[PDB]
Amino acid sequence: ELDQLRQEAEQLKNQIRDARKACADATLSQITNNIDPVGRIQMRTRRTLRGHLAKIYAMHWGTDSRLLVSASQDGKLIIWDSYTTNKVHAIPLRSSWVMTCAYAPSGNYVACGGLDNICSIYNLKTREGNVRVSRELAGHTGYLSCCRFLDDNQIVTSSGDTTCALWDIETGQQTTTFTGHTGDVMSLSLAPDTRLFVSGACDASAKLWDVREGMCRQTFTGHESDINAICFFPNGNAFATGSDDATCRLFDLRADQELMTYSHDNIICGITSVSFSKSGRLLLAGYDDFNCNVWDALKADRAGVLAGHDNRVSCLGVTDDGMAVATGSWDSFLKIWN
Amino acid sequence: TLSAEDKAAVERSKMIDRNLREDGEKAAREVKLLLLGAGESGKSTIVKQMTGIVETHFTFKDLHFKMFDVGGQRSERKKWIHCFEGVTAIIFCVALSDYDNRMHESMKLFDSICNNKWFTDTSIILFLNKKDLFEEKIKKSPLTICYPEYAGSNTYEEAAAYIQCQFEDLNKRKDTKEIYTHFTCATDTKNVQFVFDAVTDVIIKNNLKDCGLF
């Protein structure tokens, strides 16, 4: 009986891919053949935020575009003032194995997680004046790979399970569970409206999720290996992923298909993190080779290189105002380029 | 050109800097050990001797270890193994009685860990649990069922030496890392003494490299 189930699964896949092929009337390389090349993008290290003594695995900007949180496996989660390179806070984590960090849009809370399976929430603004853990969200059976706040009360997280989860921070239970993946979920990008979020997994697929019904809207495939990073285009209707194969891919939700591949013969290593400029014309990507390549997102031409790092560029961040780009790497430095 | 509050903020940042420096100095005191191994209880006995990560801190002979167990992580190792690049050493627990086979999968795990790119120069502390149960099994049934190419007698010592050789020879890079081996059924302080000795040797090597003598 299972053979028949595999049979109509296969024919459904055939029909879906046939429709997707039908939709592929053109690609960006055709209609964007006429636009002006962005040209060389010379960026300088305007700041070099120092103080971490181990690998920096995640950083996240604040909505004010000045305060940024960075997490390192030295056991610390430092809240930095970007403009003056000052350390606003330094939260000591209970578990040093942290591979994600979030900064609440309101700026009241931060979150972190990793191999402990717990998404800790830290209350920055307290009457005592010290940052205190407010709620430890537990229930995942795998490492927390990514976590993004929706509100002060809700948070969406991706785990080393095949699942993501939406949690109510006030009560601590999993408001929703997202189950569809078949491999480790490594990254998670929240849409600008926060209604939907994408998640890239080690099954070489990126899945689109609807927050309020726990159901997968769409599945995107095409990567040759596990997807380490994912980020929405500022529209919220498209997103870019990077994988251990030396390519980034730009997927669009409405066309439900892969649009552009950002690859080069020289690059033979994985992409650790990905980000978009404010306008989306520049796609920033950090690499295992000790660099961050800036890609012309419309032409797929490499626009520039941020070469000032001594180890893997684990994390990237572009401010909401798009004034600067922060690159955090395993050399324990956190550079702000402009 | 700095306001009073800006100077105070800079002072706070310097205080955080010195606190971070002290925390880093204290962290360098620690010896990081990664615990790995097949079997649901083989590493449990070792943890007794001393979900997600469970850390078992312990100070032995003034040296403060920090052993992290990853047995509870049912996820792809290659995504998070690199978190332990700087781990001082890896304890690898294998039960000798698993030669019924589970021992071959333990060999595969050891091969994938020892030859991992991240663990290019992190010495492995190999433990061979259950030598008494291995004695029982080996006087019950032969080891040839596990290793058909085995060309030694049925005696316990020969089988143990053969298993040690099979596990050690998986190390393709003998010039950068070492495999310390121990039969760990003693159920006494000898296990902590052995891991302490291996860690002392690793620290001496790291100090020689840092001083430029190696």
Partner: single-chain antibody, 232 residues
């Protein structure tokens, strides 16, 4: 809850010495810098001394330099003001004020109850109005002016508005002339141009009657204005 209690006040012969002690509880006392602020009888607040977190930087008023010494000790969560050669015009009720400095912080947020002491046998901040009568229900505006522009180059202005209800310690209403302090009702608001500043209350519930003070934090010595009184 956060609590600062002062002790060591009393009657002291002029020319004597006395140590004021501030016991702190309910917050990470070591993180906070601390201030001392006198209020002589029927007089406005007046800054005395400042001890930064970690006891790194010290500041004093020119009227207490040399004679007074501000100190702390974090392990017992206590602040001290040693006072020597007490002259007559040191008769005042001393406030122990808490203050944290980082981006987006709220300095002078909490004030202790204060201890009374009776000795017996620079940017100038101005407030024109006083003893302003107000029936409850409508809105009022109080004005404070500074001789030197309080807008710093970095772009944040440093006027602080405090409210002192009668028989109670002052509390922070506004910090940096725009930001409402935590727990303060939204009706209070601050505005102004870099040299002249105003605080407006939309609805004047009787609980908020009292004296409103303005303080500059651009540069030491910190200077309060003669507060404007609002009465029913």
């Amino acid at each position: 809850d956060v609590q600062l209690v002062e002790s060591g006040g009393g009657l002291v012969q002029p020319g004597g010495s006395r140590k004021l002690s501030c016991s702190a509880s309910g917050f990470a006392f070591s993180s906070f810098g601390m201030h001392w602020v006198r209020q002589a009888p029927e007089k406005g607040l007046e800054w005395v001394a400042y001890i930064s977190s970690g006891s790194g930087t010290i500041y004093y008023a020119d009227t207490v330099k040399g004679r007074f010494t501000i100190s702390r000790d974090d392990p017992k969560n206590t602040l001290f003001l040693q006072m020597t050669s007490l002259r007559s015009e040191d008769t005042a009720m001393y406030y122990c004020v808490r203050s944290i400095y980082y981006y987006g912080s709220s300095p002078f947020d909490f004030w202790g109850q204060g201890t009374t002491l009776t000795v017996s046998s620079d940017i100038v901040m101005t407030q024109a109005t006083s003893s302003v009568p107000v029936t409850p229900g409508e809105s009022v505006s109080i004005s404070c002016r500074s001789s030197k522009s309080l807008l710093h180059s970095n772009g944040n202005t440093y006027l602080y508005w405090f409210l002192q209800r009668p028989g109670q310690s002052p509390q922070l209403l506004i910090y940096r002339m725009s930001n409402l302090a935590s727990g303060v009702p939204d009706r209070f608001s601050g505005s102004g141009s870099g040299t002249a500043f105003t605080l407006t209350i939309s609805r004047l519930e009787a609980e908020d009657v009292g004296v409103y003070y303005c303080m500059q934090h651009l540069e030491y010595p910190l200077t309060f204005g003669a507060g404007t009184k609002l009465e029913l």
